Amino acid sequence: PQSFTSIARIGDYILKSPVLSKLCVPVANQFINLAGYKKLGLKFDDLIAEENPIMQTALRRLPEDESYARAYRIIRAHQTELTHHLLPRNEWIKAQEDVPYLLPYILEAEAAAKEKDELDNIEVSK
Amino acid sequence: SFSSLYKTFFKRNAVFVGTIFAGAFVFQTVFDTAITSWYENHNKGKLWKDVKARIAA
Amino acid sequence: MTAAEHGLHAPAYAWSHNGPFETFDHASIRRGYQVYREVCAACHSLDRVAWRTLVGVSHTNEEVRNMAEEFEYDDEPDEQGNPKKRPGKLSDYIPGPYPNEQAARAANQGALPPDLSLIVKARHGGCDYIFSLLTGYPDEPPAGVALPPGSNYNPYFPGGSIAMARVLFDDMVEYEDGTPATTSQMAKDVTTFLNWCAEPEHDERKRLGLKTVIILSSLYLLSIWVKKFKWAGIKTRKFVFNPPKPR
Amino acid sequence: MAFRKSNVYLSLVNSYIIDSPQPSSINYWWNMGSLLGLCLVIQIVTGIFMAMHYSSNIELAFSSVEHIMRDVHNGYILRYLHANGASFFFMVMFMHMAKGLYYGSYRSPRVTLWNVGVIIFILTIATAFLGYCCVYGQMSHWGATVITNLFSAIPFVGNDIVSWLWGGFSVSNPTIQRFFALHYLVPFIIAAMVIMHLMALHIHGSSNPLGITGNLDRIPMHSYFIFKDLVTVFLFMLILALFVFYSPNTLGHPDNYIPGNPLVTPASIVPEWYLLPFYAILRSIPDKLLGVITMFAAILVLLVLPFTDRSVVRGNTFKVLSKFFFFIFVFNFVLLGQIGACHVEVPYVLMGQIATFIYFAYFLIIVPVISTIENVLFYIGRVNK
Amino acid sequence: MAFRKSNVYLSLVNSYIIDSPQPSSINYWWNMGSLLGLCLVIQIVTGIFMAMHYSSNIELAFSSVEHIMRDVHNGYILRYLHANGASFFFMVMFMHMAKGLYYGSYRSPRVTLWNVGVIIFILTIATAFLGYCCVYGQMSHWGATVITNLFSAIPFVGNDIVSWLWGGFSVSNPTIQRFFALHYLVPFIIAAMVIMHLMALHIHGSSNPLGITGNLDRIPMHSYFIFKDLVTVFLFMLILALFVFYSPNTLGHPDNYIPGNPLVTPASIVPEWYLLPFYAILRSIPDKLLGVITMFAAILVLLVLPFTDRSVVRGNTFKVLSKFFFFIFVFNFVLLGQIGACHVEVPYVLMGQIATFIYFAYFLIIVPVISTIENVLFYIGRVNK
Amino acid sequence: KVEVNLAAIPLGKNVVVKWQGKPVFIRHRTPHEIQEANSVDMSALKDPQTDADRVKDPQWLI
Amino acid sequence: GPPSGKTYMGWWGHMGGPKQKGITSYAVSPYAQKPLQGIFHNAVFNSFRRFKSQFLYVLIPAGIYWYWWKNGNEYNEFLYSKAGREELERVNV
Numbered sequence A: 001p002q003s004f005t006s007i008a009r010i011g012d013y014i015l016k017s018p019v020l021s022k023l024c025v026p027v028a029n030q031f032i033n034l035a036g037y038k039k040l041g042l043k044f045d046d047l048i049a050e051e052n053p054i055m056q057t058a059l060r061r062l063p064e065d066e067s068y069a070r071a072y073r074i075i076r077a078h079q080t081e082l083t084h085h086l087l088p089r090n091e092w093i094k095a096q097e098d099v100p101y102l103l104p105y106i107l108e109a110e111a112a113a114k115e116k117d118e119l120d121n122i123e124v125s126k
Numbered sequence B: 001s002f003s004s005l006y007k008t009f010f011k012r013n014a015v016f017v018g019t020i021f022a023g024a025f026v027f028q029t030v031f032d033t034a035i036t037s038w039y040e041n042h043n044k045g046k047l048w049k050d051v052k053a054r055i056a057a
Numbered sequence C: 001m002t003a004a005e006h007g008l009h010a011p012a013y014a015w016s017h018n019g020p021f022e023t024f025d026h027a028s029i030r031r032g033y034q035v036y037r038e039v040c041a042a043c044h045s046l047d048r049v050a051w052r053t054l055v056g057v058s059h060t061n062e063e064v065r066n067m068a069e070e071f072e073y074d075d076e077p078d079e080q081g082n083p084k085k086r087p088g089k090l091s092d093y094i095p096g097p098y099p100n101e102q103a104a105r106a107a108n109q110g111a112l113p114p115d116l117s118l119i120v121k122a123r124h125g126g127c128d129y130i131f132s133l134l135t136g137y138p139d140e141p142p143a144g145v146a147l148p149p150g151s152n153y154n155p156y157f158p159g160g161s162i163a164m165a166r167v168l169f170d171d172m173v174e175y176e177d178g179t180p181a182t183t184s185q186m187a188k189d190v191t192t193f194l195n196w197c198a199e200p201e202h203d204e205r206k207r208l209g210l211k212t213v214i215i216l217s218s219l220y221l222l223s224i225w226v227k228k229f230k231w232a233g234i235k236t237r238k239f240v241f242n243p244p245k246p247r
Numbered sequence D, E: 001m002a003f004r005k006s007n008v009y010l011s012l013v014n015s016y017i018i019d020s021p022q023p024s025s026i027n028y029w030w031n032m033g034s035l036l037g038l039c040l041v042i043q044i045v046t047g048i049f050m051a052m053h054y055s056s057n058i059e060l061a062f063s064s065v066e067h068i069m070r071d072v073h074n075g076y077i078l079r080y081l082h083a084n085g086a087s088f089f090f091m092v093m094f095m096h097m098a099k100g101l102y103y104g105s106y107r108s109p110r111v112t113l114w115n116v117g118v119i120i121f122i123l124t125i126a127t128a129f130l131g132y133c134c135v136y137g138q139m140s141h142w143g144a145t146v147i148t149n150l151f152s153a154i155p156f157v158g159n160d161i162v163s164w165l166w167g168g169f170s171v172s173n174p175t176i177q178r179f180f181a182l183h184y185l186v187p188f189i190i191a192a193m194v195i196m197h198l199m200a201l202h203i204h205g206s207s208n209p210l211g212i213t214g215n216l217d218r219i220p221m222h223s224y225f226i227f228k229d230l231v232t233v234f235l236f237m238l239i240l241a242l243f244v245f246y247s248p249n250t251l252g253h254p255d256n257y258i259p260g261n262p263l264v265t266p267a268s269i270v271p272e273w274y275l276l277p278f279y280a281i282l283r284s285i286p287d288k289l290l291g292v293i294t295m296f297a298a299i300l301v302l303l304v305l306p307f308t309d310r311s312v313v314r315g316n317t318f319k320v321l322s323k324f325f326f327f328i329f330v331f332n333f334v335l336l337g338q339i340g341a342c343h344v345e346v347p348y349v350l351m352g353q354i355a356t357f358i359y360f361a362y363f364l365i366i367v368p369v370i371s372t373i374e375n376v377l378f379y380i381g382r383v384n385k
Numbered sequence F: 001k002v003e004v005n006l007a008a009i010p011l012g013k014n015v016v017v018k019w020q021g022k023p024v025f026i027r028h029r030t031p032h033e034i035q036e037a038n039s040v041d042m043s044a045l046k047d048p049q050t051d052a053d054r055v056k057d058p059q060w061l062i
Numbered sequence G: 001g002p003p004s005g006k007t008y009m010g011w012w013g014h015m016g017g018p019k020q021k022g023i024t025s026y027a028v029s030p031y032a033q034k035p036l037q038g039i040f041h042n043a044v045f046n047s048f049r050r051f052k053s054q055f056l057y058v059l060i061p062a063g064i065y066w067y068w069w070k071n072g073n074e075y076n077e078f079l080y081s082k083a084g085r086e087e088l089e090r091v092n093v
């Protein structure tokens, strides 16, 4: 329930700084490797919890081929952990392949919902 | 002959559960007898009938 | 707190009923009933144990009939309403020495002897605590204790000062099977008898536990097989993905 | 359509246990709910068959319990099964709650499920306390005395409500008969709340250990999870049979075989082992009103959990700091339980205060900070600018 | 949508009591069900608050009841409320069943509802018999002995099932403690069966006194039938407060104020008034095995009613012979109840035998023949040929 | 409200009665330590107290 | 009854996931399979893989709390000994 605009704001302030990007990005990459969702054949945007209207609009607005790829990666992850194994090492999601694909859709749906709730509580300056 | 075995024991469910109940009957009886004989034999000289036969001699 | 007021811990003796297939040694229960009746029955009671529970465990029927008839219980009154006594039967409970708590506290200098029919389940230590307590009276209380009068030293008792003196001395009870009745022999037998008095279900409980553990481990392994059989189709399921042509 | 769907009752049976779509990825930690239902059936049936022989006066409670233990047939089986089954019930309930806290089962669709679970937790704590008090041993009298006497710290009404709880002026025959009637009652309230637990579960289905959606592949509950439940059912029955037939008094306290005495205090008054962490939380506050407020807040802090979890990913499967601090919380609970069985002595009160602070800083300080740090790490580890 | 629909629990409450579409034509006989719900809640609450003071041994049962009467604050209110509320529960339940077999509610869409009703009726009879046996008066004890020694007529296992019921060899301390544990227990089974009664009702909805379909105009249950039920609730509470406060031992027998004595028979052993017709049915047969078979058949003959009703229109609203023989059946039941309270003297055994035969000939002979005759009269009164 | 009383009690012995769940001293008061009781500390102890409000009876403690 | 609110799980046919295209699944009858296949390989190699992955998370807090408990227990045993009374009085008051 942290909004992705907050995460993106803190993350962009980290990434555009010279000093703490070169400190904080290696510990993030080690965190990503130790997380081990890639060993199950999942990108990170398959991990975002989808039972909220923002993620439902983002998954509805996601294009058709990306949605089929996401559905296969989820079904393969369920089938993999059902057998208590991992995917073989040639089937792991590589680091250049782990892209944020759902993130622009989530960000525009979140900006639309925040603009909606700012306009619903608007006050004219009379 | 596994075919005749299947057709007389596992084909109909009625004879299947009848065999399960008959086996449970005889299993319960002889399993109780086997456990009680092993228990009384493992505790030899400690039981009351052993003590009673000792004090009756 | 201090190990004095904790009490020294009783060590682990090799009881003949320790172990999951073991049974009470019934000859030692019979001898322990003799030790209770000739020494322990002067102060402690056994009012949870009926006479009929002894038949077929430590004595025969005639022996428990005679040991019950040597006592007097209250009968229902006569046709004139006066109270009447009765020789004991198998249905009655083992009587205690004192008629109330006040006679006990009067006869034992204030202290009350606990009822011994649950005392090995009521003390942390089990039979080892009872054995170490009965045999653990030093000849002298160690150098520097302020022992109050009427109290004795036993380090297994929490605090040290117990209001029960040493009551087990050698050859104070003759056994009718000729066992040499030392202090440790009598303490072993009376502790086995007290453990039977606390848990008279012990042997059948362990026998039923053998049957139950065998049947349940059979069922557990067999259910592991039946689960793996029913789940084989889902464990060995393969997924292929050909990306659809765009339209 | 099939008769198992066309019927009024059989469609309920079908929709809950036969055709109910479960996520295929769920592991053996998802058998704890079926296990708790079996535990509840065990407790209710053995309790009825002992209440057919139990008398609830202050004079006859203890000796009626030994009348169950000594001269009714298989009565030791019933009493050891009821007592060790209550303890196994609480162990399996702690596993159910710690699974739900690990895998994020408290999160956004299932908060009503989490809250009905917390209500169930409170009611079975109350049931187990009353049933301990019905034995009327030495531990149960003085446990009843301490826990009931804690309500005297309420500043205007406390003496009147503790006299109303007691039915008199101390724990006596009215208190024991009240506690027996309530210990008989509250399990049916627990069964109704279990039906409501299942009703809140059924509208969204179970979660899965990935935390991602499970709407994609699902298998019915019949002949997959029926037998996967049966595995742990037989394993639980085996371990319970060990504790009932070979070590029946290990999880108990030996002071309950002394009959209850208002005149002798047993010099170390502890409750049963599963109430020991909350007893240590209560003891570690140097006050009485703040102590009872802190124990009740320690049970009610589990409701703050869906609002302090600040992460976009459901569960701790793919987070490393959340896994580390979860196991810090679990062994903090175990240390708190071990501290609650020790005396009020010198290192233990500071250990109890620090462990209480860790218990409350997990839900309120550690989880938000760690989860937002993990959010920012998940972002900047894989986006480049 | 509204929050009362978009919830889990409020959806059930809304669907059953708020937006439930009732036929607008239903008269005041359609309040007996909500009345039985109120009665059940009365019995459960007053029984719990008396079980907080009841001791169930044979030497303490009767005196614990008088301890409730004389020593507990407002305890005479609780005891008189429980006893007269049990009898009022049975009068309202007889009205519910008589409405059901007057208006044809047993018929083909609602046969499972009728059968769940018959199960509820058997369970309430058992609950009240056990609760009358718990007070351990003189009618209580000897009623327990004659009703349990009924079961010794089974020619193979009868002595062992009666020695299993008694817990010994006649009605004593195990029997009374058993009957208390069961008299608690069976009301919660009744609450579960009432939930199943409502579930079986809810699929097709209630009938109406016309017997035609009620699908055409319907009224939500809130704000119309809530207040139409409130009218009968206040009337029922008024009449019950009359019998509790001004006339409390009227429906009871005076011999339950003699303590139970196994050596003195009270020279006319009769149960409570509502079990008198089944007692007269049992007493009419000159054999014990056939007597209990005929009593259980007299209450299981309510199941042959949806198969012996041979007419095309539902209910007796528009039939004259069905109305006449219905009220013959009702006053036969009242005469049977009055025969069951008399001794076995010379006109009464013949009157009870003929009334038992009329009771059985209603379901098995009178309803088919009168249904067929009314069918062909309805045909040839209006078709021309 | 129990009414246990005094004329059958000399001193040489304590009474500790228990009633209403109340274990409680009751004892005749000696001269010897009626003014050892008025010999006491006031707050070289934990006890800034008054024996007049504690025991209103001069000769009988409870 | 009336329809209730929108949920996140339907039933068989209308679960509520995305549309699925291009995913083909294959499975064999269990009656044609070997159950208990690979149990002696998974019992030693897969068990070690799962243990190696998930044991620092469990055993570092267990080590911390067990060392804390043993140290507090040793201090409590020292304080109520003859050698450590002269710290016990200045420690408690």
Ligand code: HEC
Pocket: C035, C036, C039, C040, C042, C043, C044, C108, C111, C112, C113, C114, C116, C119, C123, C130, C133, C134, C157, C161, C162, C163, C164, C167, C190
């Ligand atoms: C005479 C008086 C006796 C005799 C012959 C025995 N006992 Fe013992 N006992 C007695 C008193 C007054 C007390 C109370 C002491 C106290 O302050 O607690 C006891 C105590 C016990 C205990 C309890 C120990 C404990 O509380 O941990 C046990 C156990 C016990 N006694 C057993 C026992 C046995 C087995 C004897 C065998 C001959 C025996 N006692 C003798 C008084 C007396």
Ligand code: HEM
Pocket: D040, D043, D044, D045, D046, D047, D048, D049, D050, D051, D054, D065, D068, D079, D082, D083, D086, D087, D089, D124, D127, D128, D131, D132, D134, D135, D183, D184, D186, D187, D190
């Ligand atoms: C919610 C489930 C229940 C729990 C957790 C529970 C817990 C307990 C516990 C811990 C005890 C003490 C056992 C001991 O220490 O010796 C106990 C005793 C008892 N319980 Fe329960 N109980 C439950 C359900 C029931 C029910 C439903 C009944 C009655 C029908 C019941 C009847 C009893 C009785 C009669 C005792 C008496 C003492 C004894 O025999 O142990 N219990 N209960």
Ligand code: HEM
Pocket: D029, D030, D031, D032, D033, D034, D036, D037, D040, D093, D096, D097, D100, D103, D104, D105, D106, D110, D113, D114, D116, D117, D118, D120, D121, D190, D194, D197, D201, D205, D206, D207, D208
């Ligand atoms: C009487 C005790 C209980 C019973 C019978 C019970 C029953 C169940 C059952 C059968 C399930 C579904 C199977 C599963 O997911 O494990 C479940 C799920 C759940 N229960 Fe319980 N439960 C009980 C107590 C609790 C408690 C005390 C909590 C927590 C406070 C709780 C929280 C949950 C949660 C969160 C889930 C969903 C887990 C998930 O699927 O992600 N339950 N319960």
Ligand code: HEM
Pocket: E040, E043, E044, E046, E047, E048, E049, E050, E051, E054, E065, E068, E079, E082, E083, E086, E087, E089, E124, E127, E128, E129, E131, E132, E133, E134, E135, E183, E184, E186, E187, E190, E252
């Ligand atoms: C289904 C609803 C119930 C019915 C029909 C019912 C019926 C009865 C009846 C007829 C009596 C005898 C009254 C007398 O003559 O003195 C009775 C007594 C009793 N019932 Fe119930 N009862 C019900 C529910 C309950 C419940 C749930 C409890 C327990 C919580 C309970 C506790 C008692 C007790 C303690 C007595 C003792 C004797 C007395 O105080 O009158 N009842 N019951």
Ligand code: HEM
Pocket: E029, E030, E031, E032, E033, E034, E036, E037, E040, E093, E096, E097, E100, E103, E105, E106, E110, E113, E114, E116, E117, E118, E120, E121, E190, E194, E197, E201, E205, E206, E207, E208, E302
């Ligand atoms: C604890 C006892 C009972 C309760 C709480 C109960 C509850 C209800 C309720 C609330 C209704 C709907 C309102 C009404 O139609 O009057 C109803 C309807 C019905 N009940 Fe009962 N009932 C009980 C006992 C019985 C019995 C003993 C029978 C008959 C064997 C029975 C048969 C019916 C029938 C046939 C209906 C439908 C009547 C109709 O609407 O046409 N019930 N019940």
